[PDB]
């Protein structure tokens, strides 16, 4: 009773490459992407997808309660200080369904400048034993890279169709100093599932993850092919079709921001499903001090009555408002 969002597949492999003509008709197909419903599958995006599931399924079908303890967020664990992001996010039995794993650059060491400077947002990963979980992190920290990649790759794409030169977030996003996370979700299935879990929407619908938009500049997401989300448009919430062959993409508020809302931040939301599945995003985000001039390519003077604001500034902010808004996940 809920239609379909259209979603296009989009094959992203000329952004890879050096032909400048077949890299702008993909950055066309990037901008109607965006004006529409604000979602599009990369398809041809060159990362072992099947890989990081069967790795990702392994690490939390076998991490123990003790572990997950001893590597839990602050929100979790009071003895864990420093751990406002990296780290392990309990499920809570009987109330909340949902835990995950979230963790930054491998850049971010205790002799990184920022972290000596205990600049907020960065904070240096926590992982579990080797021995009890063996390949795992190299795994996870290799993945990170080959999905830095592909985003860097999609910003080129962005760039161009936004009638930038192809570095114009690109040389925002360092593998040395970006902001950038992984977050490893686990959506389990529960019998009997309890209700407690639930969320019900203002139209009925049961959800696990309310309505939001993303705090990122944009969102490269692996998921299961289990059915679960839905994105507002014009014509009220539509389907988003699974598909564990590519990643989805879409826009967060910094990208809405630099764009006077020419490509807007698209509001989604999660759809409770009893199904044991992954919700993989990687959040784009620049480096702390990363500053671009906000403009509008609808105007003929490129100009926008928006001010600058630093991406550190926007993300800091942007994690506590969609925790206060949508709950401690
Ligand atoms: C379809 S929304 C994506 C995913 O939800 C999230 O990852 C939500 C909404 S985008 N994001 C967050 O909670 C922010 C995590 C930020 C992370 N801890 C960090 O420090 O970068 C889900 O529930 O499937
Ligand atoms: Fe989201």
């Known amino acids: 009773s809920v239609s379909k969002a259209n979603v296009p597949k989009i ?71 420093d751990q406002v992001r990296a780290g392990y996010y309990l499920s809570i039995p009987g109330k909340k369904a949902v835990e995950s794993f979230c963790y930054l650059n491998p850049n971010f060491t205790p002799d990184h400048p920022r972290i000596q400077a205990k600049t907020p947002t960065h904070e240096v990963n926590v992982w579990p034993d080797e021995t009890k979980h063996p390949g795992f992190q190299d795994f996870a920290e290799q993945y990170y890279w080959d999905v830095f990649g592909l985003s860097s790759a999609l910003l080129k794409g962005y760039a161009l169709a936004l009638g930038k030169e192809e570095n114009f977030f690109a040389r925002h996003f360092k ?14 299935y529960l019998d009997p599932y309890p209700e407690a879990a639930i969320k019900t929407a203002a139209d009925g619908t049961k959800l696990s993850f309310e309505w939001h938009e993303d705090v990122s500049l944009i969102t490269v997401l692996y998921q299961s092919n289990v059915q679960n989300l839905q994105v507002e448009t014009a014509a009220g919430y539509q389907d988003i079709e699974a598909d564990d062959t590519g990643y989805l993409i879409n826009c967060g508020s910094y990208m809405a921001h630099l764009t006077n809302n020419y490509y807007k931040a698209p509001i989604h939301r999660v759809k409770w499903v009893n199904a ?16 671009i001039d906000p403009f509008d390519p609808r105007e003929p003077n490129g100009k926008s009555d928006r001010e600058p604001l630093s991406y550190g500034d926007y993300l800091q902010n942007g994690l506590v408002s969609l925790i206060n808004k949508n709950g401690q996940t």
Do not use: C
């Open 11 to 81: 094959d992203v492999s000329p952004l890879f490459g050096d032909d400048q003509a077949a890299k702008m008709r993909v950055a066309q197909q990037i901008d109607a992407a965006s004006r529409d419903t604000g979602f599009f599958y990369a398809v041809n995006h060159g990362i072992n997808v099947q890989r990081l599931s069967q790795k990702t399924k392994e690490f939390h079908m076998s991490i123990t309660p003790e572990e997950k303890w001893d590597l839990a967020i602050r929100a979790y664990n009071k003895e864990h200080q």
């Open 175 to 188: 593998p040395d100093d970006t902001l950038a996370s992984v977050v490893l979700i686990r959506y389990p």
């Open 276 to 291: 044991e599945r992954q919700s993989l995003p990687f959040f784009v985000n620049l480096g702390y001090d990363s500053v």
